[PDB]
PDB file of C-alpha atoms in Angstrom:
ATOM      1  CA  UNK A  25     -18.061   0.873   2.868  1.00  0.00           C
ATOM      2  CA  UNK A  26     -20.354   0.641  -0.780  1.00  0.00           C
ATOM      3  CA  UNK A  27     -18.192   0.729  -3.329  1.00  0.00           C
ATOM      4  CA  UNK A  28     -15.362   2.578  -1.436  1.00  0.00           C
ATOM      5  CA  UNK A  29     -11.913   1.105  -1.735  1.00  0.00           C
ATOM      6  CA  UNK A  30     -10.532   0.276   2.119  1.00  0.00           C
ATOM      7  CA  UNK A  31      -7.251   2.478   0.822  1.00  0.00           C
ATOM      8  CA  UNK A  32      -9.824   5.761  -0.171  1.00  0.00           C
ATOM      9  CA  UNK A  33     -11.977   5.276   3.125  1.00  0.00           C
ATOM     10  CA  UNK A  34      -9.197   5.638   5.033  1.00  0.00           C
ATOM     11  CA  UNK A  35      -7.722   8.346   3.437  1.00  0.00           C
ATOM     12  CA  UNK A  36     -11.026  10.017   3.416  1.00  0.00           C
ATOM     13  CA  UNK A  37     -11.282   9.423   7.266  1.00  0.00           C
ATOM     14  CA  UNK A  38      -8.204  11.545   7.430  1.00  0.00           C
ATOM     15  CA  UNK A  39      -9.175  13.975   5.251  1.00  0.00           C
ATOM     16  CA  UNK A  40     -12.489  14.504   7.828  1.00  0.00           C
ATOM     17  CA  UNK A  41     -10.564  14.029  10.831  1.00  0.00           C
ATOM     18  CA  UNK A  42      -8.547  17.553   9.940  1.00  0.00           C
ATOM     19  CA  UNK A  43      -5.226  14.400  10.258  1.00  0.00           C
ATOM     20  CA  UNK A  44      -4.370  15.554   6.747  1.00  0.00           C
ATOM     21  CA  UNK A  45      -4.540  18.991   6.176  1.00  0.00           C
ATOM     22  CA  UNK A  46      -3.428  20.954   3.160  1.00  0.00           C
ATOM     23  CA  UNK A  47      -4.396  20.683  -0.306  1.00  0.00           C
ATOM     24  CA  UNK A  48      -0.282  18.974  -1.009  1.00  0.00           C
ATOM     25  CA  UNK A  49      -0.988  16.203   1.462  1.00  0.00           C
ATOM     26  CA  UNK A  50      -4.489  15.397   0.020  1.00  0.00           C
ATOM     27  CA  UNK A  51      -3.817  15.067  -3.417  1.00  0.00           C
ATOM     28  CA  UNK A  52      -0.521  12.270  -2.528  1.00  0.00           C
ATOM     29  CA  UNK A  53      -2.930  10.664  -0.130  1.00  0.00           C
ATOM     30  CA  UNK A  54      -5.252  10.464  -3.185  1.00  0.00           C
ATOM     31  CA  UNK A  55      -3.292   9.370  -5.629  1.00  0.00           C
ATOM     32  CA  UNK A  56      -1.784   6.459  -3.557  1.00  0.00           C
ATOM     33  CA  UNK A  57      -5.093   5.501  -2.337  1.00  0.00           C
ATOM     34  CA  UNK A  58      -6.051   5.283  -6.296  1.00  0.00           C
ATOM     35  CA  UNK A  59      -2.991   3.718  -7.202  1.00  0.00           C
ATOM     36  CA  UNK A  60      -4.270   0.708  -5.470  1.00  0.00           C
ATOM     37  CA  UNK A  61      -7.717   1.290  -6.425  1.00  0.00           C
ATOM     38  CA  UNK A  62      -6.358   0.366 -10.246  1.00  0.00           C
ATOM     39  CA  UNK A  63      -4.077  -2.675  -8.803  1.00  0.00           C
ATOM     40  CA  UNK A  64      -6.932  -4.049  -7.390  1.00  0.00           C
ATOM     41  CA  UNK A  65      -9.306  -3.328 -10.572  1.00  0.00           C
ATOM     42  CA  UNK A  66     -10.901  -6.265 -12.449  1.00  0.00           C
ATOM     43  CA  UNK A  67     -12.729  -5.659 -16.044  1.00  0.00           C
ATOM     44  CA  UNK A  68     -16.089  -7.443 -15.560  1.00  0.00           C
ATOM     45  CA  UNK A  69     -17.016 -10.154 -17.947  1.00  0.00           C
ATOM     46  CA  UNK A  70     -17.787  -8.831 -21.573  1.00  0.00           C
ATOM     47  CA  UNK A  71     -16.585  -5.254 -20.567  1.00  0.00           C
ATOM     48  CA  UNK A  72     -13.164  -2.777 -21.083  1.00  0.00           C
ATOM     49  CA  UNK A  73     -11.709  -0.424 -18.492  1.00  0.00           C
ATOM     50  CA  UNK A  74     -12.515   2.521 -20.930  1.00  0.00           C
ATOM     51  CA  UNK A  75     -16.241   1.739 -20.538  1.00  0.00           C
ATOM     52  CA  UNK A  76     -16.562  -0.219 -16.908  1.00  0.00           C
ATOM     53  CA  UNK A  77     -13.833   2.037 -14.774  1.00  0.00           C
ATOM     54  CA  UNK A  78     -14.732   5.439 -14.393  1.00  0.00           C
ATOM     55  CA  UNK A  79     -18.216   5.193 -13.772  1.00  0.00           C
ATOM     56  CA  UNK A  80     -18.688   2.134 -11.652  1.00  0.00           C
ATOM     57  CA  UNK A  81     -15.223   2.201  -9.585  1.00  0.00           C
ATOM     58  CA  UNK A  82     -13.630   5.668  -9.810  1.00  0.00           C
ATOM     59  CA  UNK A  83     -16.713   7.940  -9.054  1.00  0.00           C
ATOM     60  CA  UNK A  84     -17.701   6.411  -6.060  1.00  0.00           C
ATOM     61  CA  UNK A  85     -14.244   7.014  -4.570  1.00  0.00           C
ATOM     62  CA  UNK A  86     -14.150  10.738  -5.658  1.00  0.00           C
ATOM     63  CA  UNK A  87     -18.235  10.720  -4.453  1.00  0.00           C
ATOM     64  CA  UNK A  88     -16.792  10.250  -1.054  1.00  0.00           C
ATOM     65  CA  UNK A  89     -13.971  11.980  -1.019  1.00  0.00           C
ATOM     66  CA  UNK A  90     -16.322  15.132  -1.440  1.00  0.00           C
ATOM     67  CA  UNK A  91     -18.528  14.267   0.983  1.00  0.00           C
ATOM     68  CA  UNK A  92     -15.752  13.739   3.621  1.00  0.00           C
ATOM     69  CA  UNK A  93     -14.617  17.028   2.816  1.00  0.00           C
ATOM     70  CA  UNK A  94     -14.656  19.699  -0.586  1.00  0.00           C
ATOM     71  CA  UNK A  95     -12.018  19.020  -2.631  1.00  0.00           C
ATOM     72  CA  UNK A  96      -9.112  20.848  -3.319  1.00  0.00           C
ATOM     73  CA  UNK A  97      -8.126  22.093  -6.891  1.00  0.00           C
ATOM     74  CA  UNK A  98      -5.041  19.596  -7.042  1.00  0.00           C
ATOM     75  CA  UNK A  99      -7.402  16.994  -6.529  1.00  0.00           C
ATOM     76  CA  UNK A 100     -10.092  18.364  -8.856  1.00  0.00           C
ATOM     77  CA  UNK A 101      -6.986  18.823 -11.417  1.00  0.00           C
ATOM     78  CA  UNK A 102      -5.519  15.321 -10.679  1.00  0.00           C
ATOM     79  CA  UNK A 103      -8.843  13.837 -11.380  1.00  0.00           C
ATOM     80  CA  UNK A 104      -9.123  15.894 -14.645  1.00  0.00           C
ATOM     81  CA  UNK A 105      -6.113  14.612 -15.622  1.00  0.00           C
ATOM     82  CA  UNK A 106      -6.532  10.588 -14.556  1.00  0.00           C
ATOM     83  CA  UNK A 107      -9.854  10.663 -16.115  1.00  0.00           C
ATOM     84  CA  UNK A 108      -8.466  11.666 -19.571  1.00  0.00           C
ATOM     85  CA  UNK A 109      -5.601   9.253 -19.537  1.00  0.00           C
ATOM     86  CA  UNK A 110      -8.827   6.931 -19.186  1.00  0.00           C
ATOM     87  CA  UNK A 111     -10.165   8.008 -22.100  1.00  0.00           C
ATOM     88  CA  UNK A 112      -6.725   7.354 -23.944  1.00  0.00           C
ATOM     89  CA  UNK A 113      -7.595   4.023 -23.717  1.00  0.00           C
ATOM     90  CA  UNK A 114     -10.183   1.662 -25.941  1.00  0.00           C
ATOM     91  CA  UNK A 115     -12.444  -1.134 -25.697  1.00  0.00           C
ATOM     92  CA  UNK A 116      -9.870  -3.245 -27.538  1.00  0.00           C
ATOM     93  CA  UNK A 117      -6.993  -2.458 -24.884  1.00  0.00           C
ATOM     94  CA  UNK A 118      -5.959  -5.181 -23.105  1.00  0.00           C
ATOM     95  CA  UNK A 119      -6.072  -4.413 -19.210  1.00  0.00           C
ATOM     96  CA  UNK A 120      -2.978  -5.948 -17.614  1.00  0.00           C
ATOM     97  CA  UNK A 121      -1.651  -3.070 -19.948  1.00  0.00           C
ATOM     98  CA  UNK A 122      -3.898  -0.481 -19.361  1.00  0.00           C
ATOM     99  CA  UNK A 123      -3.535  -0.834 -15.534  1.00  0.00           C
ATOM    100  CA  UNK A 124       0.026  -0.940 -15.965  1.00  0.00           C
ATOM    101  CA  UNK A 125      -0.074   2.436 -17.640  1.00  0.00           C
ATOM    102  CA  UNK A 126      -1.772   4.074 -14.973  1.00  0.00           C
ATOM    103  CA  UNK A 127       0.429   2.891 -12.610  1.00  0.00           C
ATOM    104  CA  UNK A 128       2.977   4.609 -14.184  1.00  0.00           C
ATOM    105  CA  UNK A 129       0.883   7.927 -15.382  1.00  0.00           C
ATOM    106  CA  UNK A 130       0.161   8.263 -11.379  1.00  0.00           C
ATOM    107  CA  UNK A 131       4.103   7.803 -10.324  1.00  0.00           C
ATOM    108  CA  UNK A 132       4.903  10.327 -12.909  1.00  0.00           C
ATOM    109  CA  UNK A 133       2.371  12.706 -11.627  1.00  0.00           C
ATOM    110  CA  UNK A 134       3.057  12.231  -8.216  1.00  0.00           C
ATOM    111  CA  UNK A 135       7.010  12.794  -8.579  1.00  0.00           C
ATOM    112  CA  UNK A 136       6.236  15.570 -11.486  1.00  0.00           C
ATOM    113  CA  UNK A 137       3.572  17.700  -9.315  1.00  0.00           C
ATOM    114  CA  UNK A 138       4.397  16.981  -5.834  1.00  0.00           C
ATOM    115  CA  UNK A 139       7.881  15.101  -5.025  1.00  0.00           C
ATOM    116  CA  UNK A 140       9.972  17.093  -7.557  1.00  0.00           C
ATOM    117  CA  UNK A 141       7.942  20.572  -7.659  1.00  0.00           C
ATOM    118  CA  UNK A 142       9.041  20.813  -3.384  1.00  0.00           C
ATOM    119  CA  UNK A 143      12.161  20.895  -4.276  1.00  0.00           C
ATOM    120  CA  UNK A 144      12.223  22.492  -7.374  1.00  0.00           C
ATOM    121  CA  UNK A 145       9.750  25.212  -5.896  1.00  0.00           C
ATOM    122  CA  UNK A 146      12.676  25.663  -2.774  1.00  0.00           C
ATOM    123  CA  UNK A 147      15.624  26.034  -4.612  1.00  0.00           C
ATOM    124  CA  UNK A 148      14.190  28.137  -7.251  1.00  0.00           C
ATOM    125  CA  UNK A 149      12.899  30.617  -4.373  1.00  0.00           C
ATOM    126  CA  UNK A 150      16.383  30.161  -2.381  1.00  0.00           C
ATOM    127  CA  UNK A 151      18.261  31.882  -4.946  1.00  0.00           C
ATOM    128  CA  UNK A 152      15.816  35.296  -4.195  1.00  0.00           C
ATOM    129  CA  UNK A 153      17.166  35.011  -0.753  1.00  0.00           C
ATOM    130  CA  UNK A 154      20.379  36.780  -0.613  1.00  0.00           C
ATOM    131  CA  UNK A 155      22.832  37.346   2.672  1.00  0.00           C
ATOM    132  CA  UNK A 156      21.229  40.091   4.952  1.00  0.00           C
ATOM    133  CA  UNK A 157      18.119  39.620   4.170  1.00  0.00           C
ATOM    134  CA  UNK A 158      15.136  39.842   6.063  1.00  0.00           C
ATOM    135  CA  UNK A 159      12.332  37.725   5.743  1.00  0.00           C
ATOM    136  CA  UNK A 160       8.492  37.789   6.318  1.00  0.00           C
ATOM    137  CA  UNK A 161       5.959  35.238   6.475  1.00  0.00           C
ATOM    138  CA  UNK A 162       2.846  33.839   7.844  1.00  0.00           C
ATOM    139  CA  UNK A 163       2.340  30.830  10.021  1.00  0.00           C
ATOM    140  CA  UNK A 164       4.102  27.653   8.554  1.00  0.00           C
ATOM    141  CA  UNK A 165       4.073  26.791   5.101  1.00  0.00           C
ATOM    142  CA  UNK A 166       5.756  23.318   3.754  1.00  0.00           C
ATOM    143  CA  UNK A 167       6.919  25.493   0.769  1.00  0.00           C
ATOM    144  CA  UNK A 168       8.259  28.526   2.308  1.00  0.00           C
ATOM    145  CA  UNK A 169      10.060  26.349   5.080  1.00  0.00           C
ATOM    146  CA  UNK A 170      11.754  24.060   2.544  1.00  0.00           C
ATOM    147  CA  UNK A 171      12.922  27.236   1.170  1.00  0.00           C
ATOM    148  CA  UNK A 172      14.585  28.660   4.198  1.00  0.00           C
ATOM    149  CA  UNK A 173      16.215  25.417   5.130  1.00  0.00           C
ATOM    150  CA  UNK A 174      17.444  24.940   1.991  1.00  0.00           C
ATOM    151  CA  UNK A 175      19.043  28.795   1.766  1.00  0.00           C
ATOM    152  CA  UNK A 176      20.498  28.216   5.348  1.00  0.00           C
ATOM    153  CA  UNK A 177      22.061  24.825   3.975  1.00  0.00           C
ATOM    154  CA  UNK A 178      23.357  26.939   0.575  1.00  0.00           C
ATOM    155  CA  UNK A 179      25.274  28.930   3.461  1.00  0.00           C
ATOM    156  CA  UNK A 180      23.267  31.911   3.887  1.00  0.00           C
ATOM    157  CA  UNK A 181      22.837  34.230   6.680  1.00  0.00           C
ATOM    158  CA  UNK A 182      19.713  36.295   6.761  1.00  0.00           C
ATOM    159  CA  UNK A 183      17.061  36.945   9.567  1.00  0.00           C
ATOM    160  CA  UNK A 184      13.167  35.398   9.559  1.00  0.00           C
ATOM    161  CA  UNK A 185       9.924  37.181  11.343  1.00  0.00           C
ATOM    162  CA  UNK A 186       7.488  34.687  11.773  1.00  0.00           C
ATOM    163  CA  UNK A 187       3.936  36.337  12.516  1.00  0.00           C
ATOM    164  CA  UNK A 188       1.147  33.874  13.588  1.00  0.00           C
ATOM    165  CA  UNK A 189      -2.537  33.263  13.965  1.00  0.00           C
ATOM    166  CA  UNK A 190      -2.964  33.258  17.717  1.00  0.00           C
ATOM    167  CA  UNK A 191      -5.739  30.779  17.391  1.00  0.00           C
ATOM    168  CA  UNK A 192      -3.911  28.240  15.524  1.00  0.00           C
ATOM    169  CA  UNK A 193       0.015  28.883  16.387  1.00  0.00           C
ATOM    170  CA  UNK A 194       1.280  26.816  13.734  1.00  0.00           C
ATOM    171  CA  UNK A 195       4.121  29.195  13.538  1.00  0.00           C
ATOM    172  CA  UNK A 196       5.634  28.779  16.704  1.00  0.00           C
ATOM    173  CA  UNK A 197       6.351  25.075  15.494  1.00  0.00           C
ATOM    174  CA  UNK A 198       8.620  26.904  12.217  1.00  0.00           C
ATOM    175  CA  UNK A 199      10.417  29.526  14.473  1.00  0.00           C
ATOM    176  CA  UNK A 200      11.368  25.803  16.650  1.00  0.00           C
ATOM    177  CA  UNK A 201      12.814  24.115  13.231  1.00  0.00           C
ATOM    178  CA  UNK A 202      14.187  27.352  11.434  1.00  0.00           C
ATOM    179  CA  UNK A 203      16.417  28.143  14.976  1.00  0.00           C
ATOM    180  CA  UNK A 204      17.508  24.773  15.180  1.00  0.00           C
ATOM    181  CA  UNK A 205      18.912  25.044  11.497  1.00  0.00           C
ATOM    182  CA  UNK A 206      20.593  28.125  12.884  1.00  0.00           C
ATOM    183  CA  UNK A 207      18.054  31.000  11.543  1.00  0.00           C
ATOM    184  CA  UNK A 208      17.653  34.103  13.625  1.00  0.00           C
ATOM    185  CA  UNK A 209      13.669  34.164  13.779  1.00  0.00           C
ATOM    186  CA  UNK A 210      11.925  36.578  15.452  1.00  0.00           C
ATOM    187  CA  UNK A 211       8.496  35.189  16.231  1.00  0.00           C
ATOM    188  CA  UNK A 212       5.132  36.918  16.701  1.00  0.00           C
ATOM    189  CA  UNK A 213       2.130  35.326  17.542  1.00  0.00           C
ATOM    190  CA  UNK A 214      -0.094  37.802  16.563  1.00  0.00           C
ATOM    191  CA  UNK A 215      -0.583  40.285  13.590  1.00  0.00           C
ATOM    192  CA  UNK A 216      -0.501  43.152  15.890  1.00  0.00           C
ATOM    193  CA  UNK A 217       1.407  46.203  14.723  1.00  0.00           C
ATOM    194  CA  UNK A 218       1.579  44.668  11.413  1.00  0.00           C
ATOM    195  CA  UNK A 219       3.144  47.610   9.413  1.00  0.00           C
ATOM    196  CA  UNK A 220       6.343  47.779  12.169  1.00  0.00           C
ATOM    197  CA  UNK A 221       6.772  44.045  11.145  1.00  0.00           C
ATOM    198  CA  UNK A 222       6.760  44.183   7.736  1.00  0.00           C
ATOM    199  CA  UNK A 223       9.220  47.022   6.272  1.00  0.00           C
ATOM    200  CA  UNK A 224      10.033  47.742   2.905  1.00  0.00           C
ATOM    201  CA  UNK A 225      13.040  46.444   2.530  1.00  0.00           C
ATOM    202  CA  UNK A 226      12.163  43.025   4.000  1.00  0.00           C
ATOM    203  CA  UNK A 227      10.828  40.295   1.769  1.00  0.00           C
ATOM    204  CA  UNK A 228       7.268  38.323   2.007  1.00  0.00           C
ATOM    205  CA  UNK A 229       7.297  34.387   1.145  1.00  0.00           C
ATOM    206  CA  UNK A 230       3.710  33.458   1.609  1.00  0.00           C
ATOM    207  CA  UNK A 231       2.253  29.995   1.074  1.00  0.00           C
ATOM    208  CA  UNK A 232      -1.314  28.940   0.084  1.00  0.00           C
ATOM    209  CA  UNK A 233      -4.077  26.243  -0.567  1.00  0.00           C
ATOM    210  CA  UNK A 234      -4.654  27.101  -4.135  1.00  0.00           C
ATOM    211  CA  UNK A 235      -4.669  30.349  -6.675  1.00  0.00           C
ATOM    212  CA  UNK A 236      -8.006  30.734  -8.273  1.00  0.00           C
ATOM    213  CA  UNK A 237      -8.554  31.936 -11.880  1.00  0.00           C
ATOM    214  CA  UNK A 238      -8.078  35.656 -10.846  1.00  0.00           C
ATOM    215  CA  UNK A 239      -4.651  34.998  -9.793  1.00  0.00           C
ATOM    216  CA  UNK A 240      -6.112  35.296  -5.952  1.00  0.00           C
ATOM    217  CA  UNK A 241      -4.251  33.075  -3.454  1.00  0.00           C
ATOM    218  CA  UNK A 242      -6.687  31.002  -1.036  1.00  0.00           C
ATOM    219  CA  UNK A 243      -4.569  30.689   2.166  1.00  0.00           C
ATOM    220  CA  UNK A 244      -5.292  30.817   5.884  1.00  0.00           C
ATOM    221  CA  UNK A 245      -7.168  33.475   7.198  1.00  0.00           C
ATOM    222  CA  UNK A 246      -5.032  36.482   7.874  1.00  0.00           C
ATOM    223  CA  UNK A 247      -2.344  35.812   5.049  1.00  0.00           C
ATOM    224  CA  UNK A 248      -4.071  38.842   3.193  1.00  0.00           C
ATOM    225  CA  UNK A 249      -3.572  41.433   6.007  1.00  0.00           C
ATOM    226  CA  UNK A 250       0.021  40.180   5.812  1.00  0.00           C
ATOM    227  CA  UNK A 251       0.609  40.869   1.899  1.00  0.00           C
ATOM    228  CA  UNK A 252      -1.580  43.774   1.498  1.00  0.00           C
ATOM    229  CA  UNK A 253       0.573  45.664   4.828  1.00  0.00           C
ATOM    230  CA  UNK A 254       3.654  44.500   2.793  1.00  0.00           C
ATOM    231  CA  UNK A 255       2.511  45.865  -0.641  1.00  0.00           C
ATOM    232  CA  UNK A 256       1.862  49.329   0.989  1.00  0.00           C
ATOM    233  CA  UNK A 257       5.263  49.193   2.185  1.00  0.00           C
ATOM    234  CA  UNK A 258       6.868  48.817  -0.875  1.00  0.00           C
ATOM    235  CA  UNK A 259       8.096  45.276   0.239  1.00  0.00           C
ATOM    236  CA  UNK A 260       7.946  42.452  -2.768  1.00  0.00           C
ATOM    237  CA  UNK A 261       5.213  39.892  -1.800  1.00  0.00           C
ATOM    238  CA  UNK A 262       6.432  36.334  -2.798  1.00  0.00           C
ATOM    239  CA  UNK A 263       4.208  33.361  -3.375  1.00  0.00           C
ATOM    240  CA  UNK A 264       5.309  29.697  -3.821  1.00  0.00           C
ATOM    241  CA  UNK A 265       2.862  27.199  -4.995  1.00  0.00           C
ATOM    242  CA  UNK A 266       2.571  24.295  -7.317  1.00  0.00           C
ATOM    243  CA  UNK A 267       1.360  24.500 -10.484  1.00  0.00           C
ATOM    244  CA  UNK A 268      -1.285  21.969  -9.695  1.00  0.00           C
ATOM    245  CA  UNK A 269      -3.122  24.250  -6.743  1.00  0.00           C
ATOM    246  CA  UNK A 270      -3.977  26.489 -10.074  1.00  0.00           C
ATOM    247  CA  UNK A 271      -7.670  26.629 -11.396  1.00  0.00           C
ATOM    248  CA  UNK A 272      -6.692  25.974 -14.239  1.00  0.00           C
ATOM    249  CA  UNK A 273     -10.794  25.560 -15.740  1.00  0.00           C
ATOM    250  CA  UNK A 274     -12.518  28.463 -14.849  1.00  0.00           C
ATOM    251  CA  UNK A 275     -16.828  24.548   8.631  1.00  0.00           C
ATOM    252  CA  UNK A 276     -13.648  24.172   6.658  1.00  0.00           C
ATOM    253  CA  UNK A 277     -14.188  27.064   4.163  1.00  0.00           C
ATOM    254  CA  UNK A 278     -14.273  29.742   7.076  1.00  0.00           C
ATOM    255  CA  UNK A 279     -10.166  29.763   8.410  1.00  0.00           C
ATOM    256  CA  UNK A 280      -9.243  30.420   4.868  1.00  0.00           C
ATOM    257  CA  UNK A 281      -9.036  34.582   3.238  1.00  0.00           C
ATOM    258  CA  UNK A 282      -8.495  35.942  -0.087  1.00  0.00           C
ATOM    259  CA  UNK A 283      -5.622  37.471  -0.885  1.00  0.00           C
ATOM    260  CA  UNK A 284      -6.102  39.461  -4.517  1.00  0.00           C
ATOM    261  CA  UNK A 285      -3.363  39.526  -7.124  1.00  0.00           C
ATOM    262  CA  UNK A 286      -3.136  42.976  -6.539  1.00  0.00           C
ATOM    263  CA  UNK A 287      -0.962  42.228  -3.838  1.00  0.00           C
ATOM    264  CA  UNK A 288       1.039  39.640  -4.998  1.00  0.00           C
ATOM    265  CA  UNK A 289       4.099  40.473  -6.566  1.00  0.00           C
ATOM    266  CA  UNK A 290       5.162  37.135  -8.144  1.00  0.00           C
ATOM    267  CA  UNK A 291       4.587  33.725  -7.823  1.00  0.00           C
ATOM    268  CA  UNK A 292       6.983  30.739  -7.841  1.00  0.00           C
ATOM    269  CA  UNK A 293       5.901  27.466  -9.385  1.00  0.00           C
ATOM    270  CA  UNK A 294       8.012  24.403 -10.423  1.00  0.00           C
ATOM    271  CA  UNK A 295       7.766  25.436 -13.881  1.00  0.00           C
ATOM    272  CA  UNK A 296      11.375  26.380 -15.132  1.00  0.00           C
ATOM    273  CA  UNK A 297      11.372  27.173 -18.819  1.00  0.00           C
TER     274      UNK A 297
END
């Protein structure tokens, strides 16, 4: 309880519980739960939002946030971001205004970042995917699913291997959705014999928690066997990931690997021009 807003302590809960997951998830979790951390905001007597809000109210929500679980770069970005549009403000704004502007700056963000860079991200990464292809990836990523759905949909026939994590199987659930949209998938739930899977020809769309300063993806843990077999192959490594996973300034931590730039071939963000 404390100073916790009932919307942030129970999206914190969820964060803790493992109920929300990736880094995506968290961040539009976070951003609604702040959204009505602002509506709910009242400037104490004698005092402005640009002096009162981000010390007494904000921090504690991001102080347990953290201590529910590390936070992920889109939510260390987010909060980069919020807390300068903060600062935009001054003691002489009035706060019915500065609360409405917020509002707004967060529904922008949200649709800008998340709503609009899933479908940019897809499309954009659809029109690599070309009819006889053959597809590679690892476990089930929002990003690289969109994608194939949406180059099934623009009426394209190509074939998907799906390799796994036996220990978490998350990719049996994609081989399920991708073969219901009509996809041949050929499903594996192991990385065993890794270089027959992965052939030069074939392409790699590979999904991730972040991309560090380096240009390294953080992903789950066997991702990097995946795109380093595929790089030796000759076979183009893809990445898809939002521009706000980035670092852009620079338990849980064990399931994820490292996989260096080295074998990445490109990356696809929602950034167009």
């Amino acid at each position: 309880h404390k100073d916790v807003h009932p919307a942030v302590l129970a999206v914190g809960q969820q964060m803790a519980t493992f109920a929300l997951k990736d880094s995506i998830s968290r961040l539009k979790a976070t951003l609604l739960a702040f959204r009505k951390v602002i509506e709910s905001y009242e400037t104490p007597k004698g005092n402005s939002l640009s002096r009162h809000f981000v010390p007494h109210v904000l921090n504690p929500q991001i102080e347990y946030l953290t201590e529910c679980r590390p936070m992920c770069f889109a939510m260390g970005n987010a909060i980069r971001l919020l807390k300068a549009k903060v600062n935009k403000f001054d003691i002489n704004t009035p706060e019915d205004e500065a609360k409405e502007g917020l509002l707004e700056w967060i529904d922008f963000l949200i649709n800008e970042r998340i709503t609009l860079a899933e479908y940019v991200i897809a499309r954009n990464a659809a029109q690599s995917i070309n009819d006889g292809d053959t597809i590679v990836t690892y476990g089930r990523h929002r990003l690289v699913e969109k994608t194939l759905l949406r180059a099934r949909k623009e009426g394209k026939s190509f074939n998907v291997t799906v390799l796994d994590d036996p220990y978490v199987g998350e990719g049996k659930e994609l081989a399920k959705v991708l073969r219901h949209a009509g996809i041949p998938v050929l499903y594996s739930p192991n990385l065993g014999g890794l270089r027959s899977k992965v052939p030069a020809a074939s392409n790699v769309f590979l999904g991730g928690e972040a991309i560090f300063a380096n240009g390294s993806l953080h992903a789950p843990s066997g991702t990097a066997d995946v795109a380093m077999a595929a790089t030796n192959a000759g076979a183009k490594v893809i990445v898809l990931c939002e521009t706000i996973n980035f670092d852009r300034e620079r338990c849980f931590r064990l399931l994820f690997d490292n996989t260096h730039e080295r074998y990445i071939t490109g990356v696809i963000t929602e950034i167009e021009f």
